[model samples]
Target: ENLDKMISEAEVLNDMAARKLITLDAEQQLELMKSLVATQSQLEATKNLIGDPNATVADLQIAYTTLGNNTQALGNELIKL
Candidate 1:
């Protein structure tokens, strides 16, 4: 169950990051911004359960800390995070 949640977190962050980077115009930016906001809201609500208990903000922090070293998608999530 916890693994699944983590995967889901990474998956959504990855997807959103990709979209944010590919966004070319204001409309796309706006859309991605919305998605980013949603990710944040969801995280804030469930972040407490993110690590051993679930998927901690610490975990997300690490994923995002090396974001620049990863891919544009990661960079995107970094921006949102």
Candidate 2:
């Protein structure tokens, strides 16, 4: 799935919400979902940067750890349910 792999994983979470498979505090859960969606975009951007042949180590450092933070943010936030 490449970059889309991450996107679809996020979508699965959203899909679960649509199916009423999860019940949580609506306002707070909604905002985290929104942010998670936004994080996918950042991941997409990071994907592109990291894949480039001329990518610098500095760029790699930022984008690489961006993934670490993104995944942990999902763990910490989603675990609240």
Candidate 3:
């Protein structure tokens, strides 16, 4: 699973800032970073559980729901895209 692509694209605004881009306001960007990082950690943890050799059906289902929630978390963040 290319879950890391989430962090990569999530930071795309910062990536562009490397070339001079700042679509969101400074405070908004700050909140975005904080919230995004939180979601990323949640996503990463759920990913790990899903990959676990001993994860049961229930655990995998819970991880799947966690991934969904993280997606919603990111959906709630302030962004241009």
Candidate 4:
């Protein structure tokens, strides 16, 4: 919910930077931009599937677990960079 919305906002910011529409000059900026864009796509897909009437709590739990794991891994990589 709120997290998803925030992620969307982040993607927009990253997209602006990637297109030279904005500048933050942050560390690993380009990589972060690309990664956020990629992540947004994944999040959107999962959100859609989770929105399906047939989706159950178990399904959502699985989706969240996978996303959480991926997010943590990405954070680690960004830290390393």
lDDT of 2 by residue, 9-81 (tens): 5455445533432466777667666656655655665677757767787775666566546655654566655
Give the clashing pairs for model 2: none
Per-residue C-alpha lDDT of model 1 across residues 1-81, encoded as one tens digit per residue = 553465466556756565654664666665555555555444443443444455566765554433323333344545653
How much is the lDDT of residue 76 in candidate 4? 48
The candidate scoring highest on lDDT is 2
Ranking by lDDT: 2, 3, 4, 1
Clashing pairs in 3: none
List residue ranges in candidate 1 displaced over 4 A: 1-8, 11-23, 49-81
The Cα error of candidate 1 at residue 26, in Å, is 1.4
For each candidate, give its TM-score against the true structure. Answer: 0.39, 0.58, 0.53, 0.49
| TM-score, cand. 2 | 0.58
Q: Please report, in order, the local distance difference test score of every candidate based on alpha carbons.
A: 0.51, 0.58, 0.54, 0.53
TM-score of 1: 0.39
Specify the poorest-scoring 10-residue window by lDDT in model 3.
13-22
The residue pairs that clash in candidate 4, if any, are: none
Point out the higher-scoring one by TM-score: 1 or 3: 3
Q: Which regions of candidate 2 fall more than 4 Å away from where they truly are?
A: 1-25
Q: Give the per-residue lDDT digits (tens) of candidate 3, residues 21-63.
A: 2466677666656656655665566567656778787876665
In candidate 1, what residue range of length 10 has the lowest lDDT sum? 64-73
Q: Compared with the true structure, what per-residue lDDT tens digits does model 4 show for residues 1-81?
A: 754664454344334435542343555665655565555555565576567767677776665655555455445444554
